[PDB]
Amino acid sequence: GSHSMRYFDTAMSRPGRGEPRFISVGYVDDTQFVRFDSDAASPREEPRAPWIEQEGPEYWDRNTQIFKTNTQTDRESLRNLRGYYNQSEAGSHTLQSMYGCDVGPDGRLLRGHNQYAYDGKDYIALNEDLRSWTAADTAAQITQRKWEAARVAEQDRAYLEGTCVEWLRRYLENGKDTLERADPPKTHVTHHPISDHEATLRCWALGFYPAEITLTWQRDGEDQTQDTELVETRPAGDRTFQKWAAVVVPSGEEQRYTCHVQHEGLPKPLTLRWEP
């Protein structure tokens, strides 16, 4: 019943190949709903959810102009960070950020986020108080100084407590048929002999949304964390996700093993066994 909105921004310099690419992707939970890309050949293409298209040209024009401003700001920020780290003009560098809000079932703010990474390392983040910063190093301390001087946290707080929460509500209402629907996993257990004395049991979860899921193997009711191979949850391409967990078991001992599945779309948690 809880939900999040998050934008994932990436600015990446490419010396000799133009100005840095900037892309901003917006998500409600695990659903991408907008994408803005500085390299877009036609803004008429920058994909958006059907429930965003219904917002009309005013929404799109406003957001396009914010994106253009953000492109400039993060391009100049890349330039400044290159200086703070005494880096040459020759290499490519990456500035990432994530920002947005988490709300509960009642649509009330649980917490806000606004953080950044440079070349894959945490750089600066707005604290949970939405008033103060945590800077990772002496470079980020300069950004902190500039942002404190310009009262940026106050603007970020206003967005996170106001705009973000208000629009997440609007989006959840307009997109309810998908955004507020949890699709349970379809599950099964497969069995693959490895040798005459061992076999793999693989517990499958397919077709679920959102991506959050718990998939565990037990032996005689004891968690098999160390002995379980657990692949990363992966997108199917139709909004849903997939995952599997596998354990290697001695031949004939299969019935000592149970797969346990928890997911928001399930009426109740599943317990599965290999069914020869």
Binding site: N70, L95, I124, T143, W147, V152
Partner: peptide, 9 residues
């Protein structure tokens, strides 16, 4: 809805 980034880092 996008958040405005106005102040250079």
């Amino acid at each position: 809805e996008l958040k405005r980034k106005m102040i250079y880092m």
